[PDB]
């Protein structure tokens, strides 16, 4: 039954629970003497791996501790070692799960209450440390506060005098916390419907309400209440004087967050009265549901079934909470906890799992998001754009568009009309141009996407006066005759020279127009004539000129240029630096606010980041080969491996210098983007000041938030460039509006 | 780790095997596990290379898409092969995009041993997919019977 023990441990939570707990203690006792070490490992792992039902497992420990006092002895000691090493590994996400598990144990009388108070004193005392990042101080305070709901009433009455000083110290710290990072993190800057506040501020207020009403909560479930008689005689265990690990340079702390509300109890009048925003029982609901998503993110069917059957579903309206939680996971703008596409399909299975009510609230939830689009962070809008279009894709594109009739009588660059324009454009990607026109009411015909057809400058009937037209027709027959690369050069030799920009334009326009049928034809054309592009576009400005003429060919088909540039980079036709310059070129200025251009920039960045990691990975494995051979050389004294080591020694140095070459290339890419980002924004700021116009414009609002978004999606990489950015680009002389973005980013993690 | 949490009944290979493959069963077993190409099923005949690229780009970047053409008609038979750069990226598409409606049509995905020349043509007697001949019901997406 070695494999049986872990199975039955996981079975207790699923689906007479108290009777199930009682039986579980008996079977655990039978094989405890010979499997004690293995049992401790299983309980320790499930304490951090399964925080969704930690109250269930705490009662299991209490019953085992009650029957065997010695069992609870080493288990607590083993639990501390797990916590002690977890902090050393900078794995704080489950560290809070562990400290919650310890806190709930005092309810099961496993842990002495005074010892737990001294444990929290050290956590709060971290704020008294100096020269330590403010983020680290936040986590320890968060860990203590987060565990309070499970330990609120019982711990308070025992040692109120001590923890009141603890509460004062925590309250004192929250007053002087830096709040510079909130504006980046809040999805909505507006406060009228529901304010967005930092998690500590929201959590603290909920604790105050819980403290106000004598620490009573209704949502949480406490199985140990039923086993009151048994746990009374159990002897408590005193915790060792734990101390937090000292701060180290390599230590990494979790980023600050912000919890957003999109629902109010007035939204569902007939249903159960859901907890208010500053209600502690609401926090535990979202926290459990987040862990449900975290635990079963791989299995969408299993995840959907688990959260819908959430314990205590009768008290609280599940449909409104689950929808809010999914959007909460989706709009964590630093990074969603999983792949973005997971949430789109998760709601699909949820929708079909509860067809009775969930489609109604989800439709209502979508409308609520639409009305708040006036002040929503753009990086979250793109996630909203992708989900809503995809959700419409697998629902026959059925929607009451006439409801959003207000978008027509607005500025075309206002967020609401822009949202409609982007959604239809994305819906165009999944269907036909005619298909979108049919479903949309005719009044929105102005917002319908344009027909994605190639634009040929050298058209048959356009004009014969355009330069190079005679040469252009020669390219057409050459391509249709499957000409070789060398003879293509001969045709280009006749092009007059005003490097030659004219040669690029005539070659690109003809080649793209010929391969305008599909992506496969276009990909083949570039591969077929790979050498031609490399020879012609040798200069950096020549590489840039390839993109601008390419954009003119497919201005009306954003998806076509979405992948066309991607293939060019991987074929070394144009480096990432050229693409970044092309984005901010005056040619794209009119469409700079479009969503598709930013997908280009991020895809280019990801390719550079992915490529440099692969080179680093290749260096590491080659480095380990030296370690592997040296270990074998020590074991087997072979003198013929000296030449073998020499082969890899000259190999690794080539990789090492290549990494520096690659890292410098990656560093240059971000430097170019930020350098190019400053000049455009500064130009906007000075002209608005000179002309007296308001700075807050739809163009400026969209552009400034893109600067935040690129910071957020690659903060880990940008961490290596703090010295360079501060000394060169982001300086004190810079405008405060631009510098404020860097002000919050550096304080975001440090 | 934990036995229950590590379970994911979407990445594991299906019972399908390519009988045209040169090698025994175990060769696919090891090759399928370390593979970055997956096969889709029962696409609409009117679907296009752009649509499938857009849908699967959500999981991650694509290296190459091979449309499933007819043996003789040289026309799409409602299936295609999609190849990702990294295995981890391809798993997400299999975990989530699989079973999701596309062009008002439910699609089905499965791992593949890797693209080979001449493998994109339908192996059915008529020229399309073998399942087409055994199909009996009426559907416009698959050109009728
Ligand atoms: C059902 N199915 C068909 N194909 C591919 O589709 C083409 C023709 O498949 P088929 O001969 O119609 O499949 P069958 O023998 O199971 O009836 C070939 O290129 C096959 O590799 C398939 N390819 C993969 N990877 N997985 C599948 O389940 C699958």
Residue numbers in the entry:
A (entry chain A): 27 to 41, 45 to 527, 539 to 790
B (entry chain B): 5 to 149
Q: What did the publication describing this PDB structure actually write?
A:
The nuclear cap binding complex (CBC) binds to the m7G cap of RNAs transcribed by RNA pol II. It is comprised of NCBP1 (also known as CBP80) and NCBP2 (also known as CBP20). As such, the CBC regulates gene expression at multiple levels, ranging from transcription and splicing to nuclear export and translation. The CBC promotes nuclear mRNA export through its interaction with a key mRNA export factor ALYREF.
We collected cryo-EM data from the mixture of the CBC complex and mALYREF2 in the presence of the cap analog m7GpppG. The data yielded two maps that correspond to the CBC complex and the CBC-mALYREF2 complex, respectively. The CBC map was refined to an overall resolution of 3.38 Å. The electron density of the cap analog is clearly visible bound to NCBP2. These conformational changes were also observed in the crystal structures of ligand-bound CBC. Overall, the cryo-EM structure of the CBC determined here resembles the previously reported crystal structures of the liganded CBC, with root mean squared deviation (RMSD) of 0.81 Å and 0.71 Å for NCBP1 and NCBP2, respectively.
